[PDB]
Design a protein around this ligand. Structure first.
Ligand SMILES: Nc1nc2c(ncn2[C@@H]2O[C@H](COP(=O)(O)OP(=O)(O)NP(=O)(O)O)[C@@H](O)[C@H]2O)c(=O)[nH]1
Ligand SMILES: C[C@@]1(F)[C@H](O)[C@@H](COP(=O)(O)OP(=O)(O)O)O[C@H]1n1ccc(=O)[nH]c1=O
Ligand SMILES: [Zn+2]
Lengths: 113, 308, 50
């Protein structure tokens, strides 16, 4: 028995955009896990087609962490929204285990087709 | 009873003979790579829930081919059936058979895996990484089953020593082609998993010594073309065995064929960078860390170790 | 010599491995033989190939 993710993870929102200063506000679904030394955000998700630069305020309030994305993958899900068409976005450089955990929790709890 | 054996044999017509008493299981001590919410490690546990039947060749001789049929609840049955139906066209996947039988006033589902090997890759890795000359029966049996040596070779005691009797390296290097074929089949399986949309972790105890894969019990589904195989502990635990057995020897022959002459290189050639990238692409396609053939381009000393 | 110039002008940058310089340009060879069977397998007769 070797499993993908016993004990799941959490998520709250963040901002995103197309280019460097295109960030307006909440446009994403950015998954994360809380490391003691700052929480690492894992997986973004978009109703928009082509985003390439998201941004997160610092734990100190001085700087801001930028996150540029790789090309998306499309999928549609079901919920009282009916057809729920989106594009998953993994922060570029995310390795295979992190994508595995994200997809695991997502497809396990969130409806998919 | 005996209708059980006839149902297990199926359309294969294989002349099976029991390895246990009746329709009861068979307990063995085997090596597993385990990680869940309670325990973790690479250790020898007690495998219980399986009935095994050994296939008989003609002339009534027993061959190294087994039918392993185990017993399931009604949910894992459907889960494995769905995943297998998605993955049944790969040549690196073992043959499965799902049915229902009557043991008592009950109908119980069974899953049969056809034509497996007595040992797995985890058994070989554990045997060679936890060597103890006071008890090494698994290693002896693996060595004599695949024609690396004969049974009396173990009478020239000090036979395991590397300094005394340096001839054991020639005996160990007879497993290299088996290991190389296993690597190729793993790459094939990963490609199929990605194209079908399956996400799972690959362990050494779900591959036999022929190279075939089974046990799709912890796998999940996504959209096709977006699957993810996780292969971080497989390759890493298997790494020390690739140089002991000299698995890549066939790469020095004309068309990767051991029955052909050696490649004759130009003497004035020293670079060999594209060859290194081709080898990495052929055997380690889904290892997802950057590889630098020249360590002038590495980022720190951890990367230097990784690439060297 | 003229062989060294040849094998250096056959390189694509002027760099060659050092271990091949004696192998292709040296004019004299020395062989050290431990016993008779090795002599019979390597330096037999008046001329040999290597
Ligand atoms: N290859 C092989 N394995 C056997 C045989 N008999 C017992 N086994 C054991 O059965 C294991 C595979 O059974 P299975 O339970 O389906 O896989 P698993 O690795 O235990 N994972 P899980 O417990 O989640 O199903 C092998 O790893 C090995 O330890 C046999 O004849 N051949
Ligand atoms: C069940 C096994 F004998 C045997 O089936 C095997 C299953 O491991 P996986 O499947 O790989 O590991 C053993 N095991 C595992 C996990 C555990 O908390 N206890 C345990 O004994
Ligand atoms: Zn490097």
């Amino acid at each position: 028995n070797n499993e993908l993710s016993p004990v799941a993870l959490r998520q709250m929102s963040c901002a995103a955009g197309t280019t460097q200063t295109a960030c307006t506000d909440d446009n994403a679904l950015a998954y994360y896990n809380t490391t003691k030394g700052g929480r690492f955000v894992l997986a973004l998700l978009s109703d928009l087609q082509d985003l390439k630069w998201a941004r997160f305020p610092k734990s100190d309030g001085t700087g801001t962490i930028y996150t540029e994305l790789e090309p998306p993958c499309r999928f549609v899900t079901d919920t009282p929204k009916g057809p729920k068409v989106k594009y998953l976005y993994f922060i570029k450089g995310l390795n295979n285990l992190n994508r595995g955990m994200v997809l695991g929790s997502l497809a396990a709890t969130v409806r998919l087709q | 009873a005996q209708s059980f054996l006839n149902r297990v044999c199926g359309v294969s017509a294989a002349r099976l003979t029991p390895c246990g008493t009746g329709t009861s299981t068979d307990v063995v001590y085997r090596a597993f790579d385990i990680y869940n919410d309670k325990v973790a490690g690479f250790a020898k546990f007690l495998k219980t829930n399986c009935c095994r039947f050994q296939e008989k060749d003609e002339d009534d001789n027993l061959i190294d081919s087994y039918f392993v049929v185990k017993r399931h609840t009604f949910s894992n049955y459907q889960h494995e059936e769905t995943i297998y139906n998605l993955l049944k066209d790969c040549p690196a996947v073992a043959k499965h058979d799902f049915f229902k039988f009557r043991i008592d006033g009950d109908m119980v589902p069974h899953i049969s895996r056809q034509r497996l090997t007595k040992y797995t890759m985890a058994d070989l890795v554990y045997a060679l990484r936890h060597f103890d000359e006071g008890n090494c029966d698994t290693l002896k049996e693996i060595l004599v089953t695949y024609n690396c040596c004969d049974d009396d070779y173990f009478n020239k005691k000090d036979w395991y020593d590397f300094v005394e009797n340096p001839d054991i390296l020639r005996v160990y290097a007879n497993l290299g082609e088996r290991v190389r074929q296993a690597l190729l089949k793993t790459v094939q399986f990963c490609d199929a998993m990605r194209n079908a949309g399956i996400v799972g972790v690959l362990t050494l105890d779900n591959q036999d010594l022929n190279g075939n894969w089974y046990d799709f019990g912890d796998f999940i589904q996504t959209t096709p073309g977006s699957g993810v195989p996780v292969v971080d502990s497989y390759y890493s635990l298997l790494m020390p065995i690739l140089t002991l057995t000299r698995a890549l020897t066939a790469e020095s022959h004309v068309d990767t064929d051991l029955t052909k002459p050696y490649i004759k290189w130009d003497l004035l050639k020293y670079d060999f960078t594209e060859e290194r990238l081709k080898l990495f692409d052929r055997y380690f396609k889904y290892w997802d860390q950057t590889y630098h053939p020249n360590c002038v381009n590495c980022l720190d000393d951890r990367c230097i170790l990784h690439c060297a | 010599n003229d062989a060294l110039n040849n094998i250096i002008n056959n390189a694509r940058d002027g760099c060659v491995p050092l271990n091949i310089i004696p192998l292709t340009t040296a004019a004299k060879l020395m062989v050290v033989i431990p016993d008779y069977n090795t002599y019979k397998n390597t330096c037999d007769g008046t001329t040999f190939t290597y």
